[PDB]
Paper text:
In this paper, we report the crystal structures of a lectin from Agrocybe aegerita, designated as AAL2, in its apo- and complex forms with GlcNAc and GlcNAcβ1-3Galβ1-4GlcNAc, as part of our endeavors to develop a system to facilitate the identification and purification of O-GlcNAcylated proteins. AAL2 was recently discovered from the fruit body of the edible mushroom A. aegerita. AAL2 was found to specifically bind nonreducing terminal N-acetylglucosamine (GlcNAc) moieties of either alpha- or beta-linkage and was reported to have the activity of inducing apoptosis in hepatoma cells in vitro as well as inhibiting hepatoma growth in tumour-bearing mice in vivo. The overall structure of AAL2 monomer is a single domain with the shape of cylindrical torus with a diameter of about 51Å and a height of about 27Å, showing a very regular, seven-bladed β-propeller fold formed by the blades packing in a circular array.
The structures of AAL2, AAL2-GlcNAc and AAL2-GlcNAcβ1-3Galβ1-4GlcNAc were determined at resolutions of 2.0Å, 2.1Å, and 2.0Å, respectively. There are two virtually identical AAL2 monomers arranged around a two-fold pseudoaxis of symmetry in an asymmetric unit in both the structures of AAL2 and AAL2-GlcNAc, and one AAL2 monomer in AAL2-GlcNAcβ1-3Galβ1-4GlcNAc, while the protein exists as monomers in solution as determined from its elution volume on a Superdex 200 10/300 GL column. As expected from the sequence homology, the structures of AAL2 and AAL2-GlcNAc complex are very similar to those of the corresponding structures of PVL, with root-mean-square deviations (RMSDs) of 0.7Å for Cα atoms. Each blade is a β-sheet consisting of four anti-parallel β-strands arranged in a W-like shape and of about 56 residues in length, and is named W-motif according to its shape. Seven tandem W-motifs of the AAL2 monomer, numbered WI to WVII from N- to C-terminus, are organized around a seven-fold axis of pseudo symmetry. The first β-strands of the seven W-motifs are located innermost of the AAL2 monomer and form a central tunnel that is filled with water molecules and almost blocked by a long N-terminus loop (except for a small opening). These 7 innermost strands point to the same direction, from the ‘entrance’ to the ‘exit’ of the central tunnel, and run almost parallel to each other along the direction of the seven-fold propeller axis. What is notable is that the seven sequence repeats observed in AAL2 do not match exactly with the seven blades, but instead have a shifting of one β-strand. WI consists of three consecutive strands, i.e., strands 2, 3 and 4 at the N-terminus, and one strand, i.e., strand 1, from the C-terminus.
Author numbering:
A (entry chain A), B (entry chain B): 2 to 404
The structure:
Amino acid sequence: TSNVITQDLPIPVASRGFADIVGFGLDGVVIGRNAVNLQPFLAVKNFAQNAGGWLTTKHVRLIADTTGTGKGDIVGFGNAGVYVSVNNGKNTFADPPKMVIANFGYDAGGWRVEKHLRYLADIRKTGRADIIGFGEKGVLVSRNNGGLNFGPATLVLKDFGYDAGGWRLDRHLRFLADVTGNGHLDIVGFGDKHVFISRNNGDGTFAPAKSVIDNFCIDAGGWKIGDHPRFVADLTGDGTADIIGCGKAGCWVALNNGGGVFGQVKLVINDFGTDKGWQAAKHPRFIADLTGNGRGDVVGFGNAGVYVALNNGDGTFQSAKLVLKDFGVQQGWTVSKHRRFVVDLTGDGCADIIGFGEKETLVSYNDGKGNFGPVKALTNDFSFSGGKWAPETTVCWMANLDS
Amino acid sequence: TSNVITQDLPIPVASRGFADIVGFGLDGVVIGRNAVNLQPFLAVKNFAQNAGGWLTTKHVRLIADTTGTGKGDIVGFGNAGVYVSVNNGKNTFADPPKMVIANFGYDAGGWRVEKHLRYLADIRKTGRADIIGFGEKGVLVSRNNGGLNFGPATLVLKDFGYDAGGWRLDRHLRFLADVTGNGHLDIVGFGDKHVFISRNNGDGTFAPAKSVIDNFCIDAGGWKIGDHPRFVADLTGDGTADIIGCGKAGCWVALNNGGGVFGQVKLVINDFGTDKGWQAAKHPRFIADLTGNGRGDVVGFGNAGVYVALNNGDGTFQSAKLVLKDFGVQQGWTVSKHRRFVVDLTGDGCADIIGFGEKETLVSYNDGKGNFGPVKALTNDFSFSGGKWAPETTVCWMANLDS
């Protein structure tokens, strides 16, 4: 297992735990705490389409531990800066939220959802999240200095930026993961001709970017943003992030030697790629630990239902098989209306499947071996419900509120 | 609300949160973590009747944060000493447990469930639990030095002991609670003729026992152990512990002024006592916050069902009333086979009711005002299921594993 931050999944969820639902609904933040009587709780009247004027087109809304308590706080990147609603521990969130910094906003620093990435991460391993943004001139970091005091937004690396040199959301990928093996989150960038790494030194600095693979990129191997999803994830159990991507012929991986050196790029699964009919607009794919061994498995929501290929434990894989006859295109699930997640809901380290459907939120539980039980109606809440949870106007995440 | 440790409830549960089931079953520690798919998880194959030789008549089995991570660990006072299974933060408990001190055991120091009390509490307020024992010659403490290092068991107070002077379980009550107002757990002892306090200094030392109330005792008002239950809880909202006892004619309180000095003993509820049929063998009673206002309310499981009296906020009460035709004698609930709990399961700060019955574990949710909804079968697990969960051979607590 590696803790990892991607563009699609900026909020790390524990591989072994009881994931909670956090929804930025139309009228505010709705918490669905993983519990015996799941009931949506309107925790904060803000951070919402119809409370505070929050927009998916202009703002970023996340969950992270900004105080160091181990409790996840609500964080919003608004117009004038970053606002935080502190989780008081005992199921209460501060409302109204407090503005902790005049940077990383639409009006503060000219940040744009179309050009930049903003993440929250404990890059210094101090137990609370720094602000890290992939901006114009490079990677800007504001150190979290306790008590919601954030250091100056500081250009810490002149690379991986819209204007340093030429990073684009329609061409490239920028993730954070420990690939060097020092416990700290590094920068992993899929550029034009190479995957680049910038090592996190440990002390709030990143080394200059270095090329590590001549593949997985738009102009090295023909990897395209829509059609060929790429991931970073521990596939060997050594605790460092390997690389895997769903391409044309199937899934290709390059394994980390444990220090950020990558081996040859090999086809490990002849499925999940375009040759077998997997399309970005229809078929969400994920890497998640479905067997509790700390190694990433491949999960895909295909046409007839969900397909999985299990990791043998060493970065090679078994064949893909259909494991669950639901949550697929045949059953009516769509990327534009519905939300699907692959996360542990039950504390056994084997990821379960939950889907926010048209009118119902459904779940199927992993059996502890990578197989799935009968689908069950968990709640009417969080479902699309004719627009109540439209992707255009709401954001939903799984997160461990108690981490 | 005040943090309180009692003989019947040695483990404090949060008044606002999602309490977890922790059961010491026949085959090991079973965690019933409060979650969407509640299932017994055999976490440690020890601490059990048929795993490690653990017995209700010989050993003490608890949950407490021994490491300071905010996560409850499994702790057992066994034969040769105290054993801990650390909770790693990812629903994993060390197995086998490791011994942390060769004392406070049946063989090590001659501790007896029939004679002595053993608690775990953060009496120094450093984020982790010291061991506190009421033994033969007085109060013995072992300082939790971190990393599971425990200091020598030290006789810190020559009072409250089986042989200093004659404290007996058939007769007296010994609790930990903050009654001085200094934020630290004090010793509260219902002796022969007085309620005694021993103030907690801070350094984890206690001042000589001082008489504070001439009442609530076997020789001061005729208070008997089973028949006339006494509790300590915050009934005023100030964070200091008040005192309430269910006498013959109803509930008498003595209110804390906030500095550990008590007002006149007065009758505030005309029910819950032997006069109105309440009996030690049949009708367990509790103080719990049913309204979320931080003041303790009175709950009793009677004949026809559950009765409550709601605190006005200041230690005076509305009249008692039956809120639920269930969990009572007439529905077949007995103290000898079944377990009943009054704890928040839903994080709204209003305590709910859960019961481990004959073949089923049932729940009724507080509506948020002290009323209760229909009883729902939660799971078949943790139920007597003769006699998988016999009280003679197993132990079940509610606890918040994630503080």
